[PDB]
Write an enzyme that holds these catalytic residues in place. Structure first.
Site, mmCIF file in Angstrom:
data_model
loop_
_atom_site.group_PDB
_atom_site.id
_atom_site.type_symbol
_atom_site.label_atom_id
_atom_site.label_comp_id
_atom_site.label_asym_id
_atom_site.label_seq_id
_atom_site.Cartn_x
_atom_site.Cartn_y
_atom_site.Cartn_z
ATOM 1 N N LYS A 176 0.823 -1.209 0.000
ATOM 2 C CA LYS A 176 0.000 0.000 0.000
ATOM 3 C C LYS A 176 0.860 1.263 0.000
ATOM 4 C CE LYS A 176 -2.216 -0.818 3.719
ATOM 5 N NZ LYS A 176 -1.850 -2.234 4.030
ATOM 6 N N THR A 177 1.891 1.286 0.839
ATOM 7 C CA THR A 177 2.691 2.499 1.006
ATOM 8 C C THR A 177 3.505 2.778 -0.255
ATOM 9 O OG1 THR A 177 2.791 2.138 3.396
ATOM 10 C CG2 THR A 177 4.473 3.594 2.434
ATOM 11 N N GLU A 186 -3.372 5.571 1.420
ATOM 12 C CA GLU A 186 -3.455 4.212 1.932
ATOM 13 C C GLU A 186 -4.782 3.981 2.642
ATOM 14 O OE1 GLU A 186 -0.338 2.383 4.233
ATOM 15 O OE2 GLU A 186 1.034 3.903 3.423
#
Ligand SMILES: Cn1nc(Nc2nc(N[C@@H](COC(=O)N3CCO[C@H](CN)C3)c3ccccc3)nc3[nH]ncc23)cc1C(C)(C)C
Ligand SMILES: Cn1nc(Nc2nc(N[C@@H](COC(=O)N3CCO[C@H](CN)C3)c3ccccc3)nc3[nH]ncc23)cc1C(C)(C)C
Ligand SMILES: [Cl-]
Lengths: 303, 302
Positions: free
Chosen positions: B114-115, B158
């Protein structure tokens, strides 16, 4: 924008034809199939719908989304074609709920009073020239002088907590009239989650005469206006005079002078339905005179 | 409009000031209290915030919503006064999630990636001139060095499946990178997340992940799939893994094959880049900006 053309399977059917009309008025391309041509389908194609008679796979060609009456039936060739291509297929209840994304949505929830309150809201808004589309029993109706479904800025709808679409509504204003236990804690959580679908700038309208609504009120992290006969209700009925088919009462509202109104229906429960309506009308800037007109001239649900 | 004035308790915090900055850019009245003035409160004051030093009940007067860092401290006089009046008091994570409502929100979900994917999306959108605000680890950032957050239409963030706001997010575009281990309940949470998309939204789905592939037929929203899989809509092929750098060719519907590179090794970073390419393509970003944004990215937090 990943939705340009919407195809209805059985567009002539109940609930289906009103949704299609709203979507045409929002500017979408709408097509639909039905087993028989009717006045409903001929009116839809004058509004811009492309109508197919019978079901065949080709009727779904070019659609970005399919709407079906309820169950997803892959035995239907239009649905099967859509599913094979990962074209979304949604029941009409979910497309109905999705209309609130385009309008100033007012969702009326609670165990008792939803239909009457929805109808009273439509009446008072029509008396103020605001002419909402309103949804009762899954059917779209136009209030006031404006006859085009969905053309109004406002969309007022019953919100039934047993519907799978309940928690996907995106209203601007949400009412809870009462919460009746006839799992109860799952049910309270459902109503709390419903109200948190409001934006932070939206409005929760809460009947504090109801024990369970009063109990969940501190959990609601959204702007609230409470109503009731209760001494602590923001919008409060006093001086209630029941007189036959009609009830007179005085409504207290924050930062307003007391207002004498009447509703042309008997029973304390209709004072409460009128209070919910007054909270919403007041929030929308409707005049005292139009509130009085819409409550006292109300001819009943369905009339 | 029942929220005109938002009051931040402890506005000088690193995770509070950015939310305040966006709300100011959106035209809201914003006030905040803190124990001491700082360069942070002065920056906010220049953007329009009303600043109170010290905590006292009256700092919250006129507020429509209070924002606190996380826990609701009923001993704080500003919180206590608000609660007495039914002013909503919300943690900053929930106000942060609500910003997606005002913006073209791109939510990046999944167990892994996600990051990095959020960061690559920001890099490509910046290279396309779209000036995105983006959220990683609860921190708001913007590409523009000396800029007020929230200026652009785009908000990339996110989405953590374990946050209370996960199922209230309102994105226009949502990515699911993978779903990795009750587990049956986790699948349902990702399916519900994806149905928060409008019908005209877009779900971007990694079909190399077995669980994403499994839930794909349940998603009644427009979808674009990606991966190395032969049946992915948007597919990485011709992959050359040369040191810390990977080259690959991306196949896209209705486009010529496009050769790209990313300077982070590992096949998972090909997948992070494919998700980015799907989203950039959908938004109309040029091949040149995709190539520049992917190749120039130096790494998370650099
Ligand atoms: C059309 N119509 N419209 C209504 N409208 C409302 N009725 C109520 N309350 C009900 C009392 O409701 C309960 O007795 N309940 C519910 C809670 O759970 C309890 C078990 N635990 C059981 C009520 C009934 C009669 C007089 C006053 C109040 N409150 C409301 N607030 N705003 C609107 C509104 C009600 C109705 C009826 C009932 C005629 C169909
Ligand atoms: C920064 N970063 N970025 C990622 N991005 C993505 N990863 C994945 N898939 C993961 C599945 O990884 C697991 O399930 N693992 C690995 C770890 O140990 C687990 C024990 N349970 C089993 C993967 C890992 C390695 C090769 C290929 C695919 N799919 C994706 N689609 N789109 C983006 C994307 C992934 C990562 C990490 C944190 C893993 C380095
Ligand atoms: Cl209808």
């Amino acid at each position: 924008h990943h939705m340009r053309r919407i195809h209805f399977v059985g567009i002539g059917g109940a609930g289906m034809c009103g949704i299609a009309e709203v979507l045409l008025n929002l500017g979408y391309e709408v097509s639909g199939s039905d087993l028989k041509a009717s006045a409903v389908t001929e009116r839809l194609e004058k509004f811009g719908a492309q109508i197919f008679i019978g079901h065949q796979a080709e009727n779904a060609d070019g659609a970005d989304v399919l709407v079906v009456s309820s169950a997803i039936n892959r035995a239907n060739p239009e649905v099967a074609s859509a599913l094979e291509r990962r074209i979304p297929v949604v029941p009409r209840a979910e497309m109905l709920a999705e209309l609130m994304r385009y309008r100033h949505g007012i969702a009326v929830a609670g165990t008792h009073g939803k239909t009457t309150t929805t109808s009273l809201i439509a009446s008072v808004f029509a008396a103020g020239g605001l002419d909402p589309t309103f949804v009762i029993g899954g059917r779209l109706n136009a209030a006031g002088t404006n006859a085009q479904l969905g053309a109004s800025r406002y969309l007022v709808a019953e919100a039934d907590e047993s519907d799978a679409s309940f928690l996907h509504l995106q209203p601007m204003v949400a009412v809870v009239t009462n919460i009746d236990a006839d799992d109860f804690n799952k049910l309270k959580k459902t109503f709390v989650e419903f109200l948190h679908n409001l934006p932070f700038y939206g409005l929760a309208v809460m009947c504090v005469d109801d024990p369970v609504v009063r109990e969940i009120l501190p959990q609601i992290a959204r702007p609230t206006v409470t109503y009731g006969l209760s001494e602590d209700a923001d919008v409060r009925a006093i001086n209630i005079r029941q007189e036959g088919m009609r009830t007179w009462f005085t409504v207290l509202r924050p930062e307003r002078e007391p207002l004498d109104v009447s509703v042309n229906m008997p029973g304390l429960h209709n004072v409460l339905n009128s209070l919910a309506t007054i909270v919403i009308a007041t929030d929308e800037g409707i005049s005292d005179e139009a509130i009085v007109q819409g409550l006292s001239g109300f001819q009943g649900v369905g009339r």
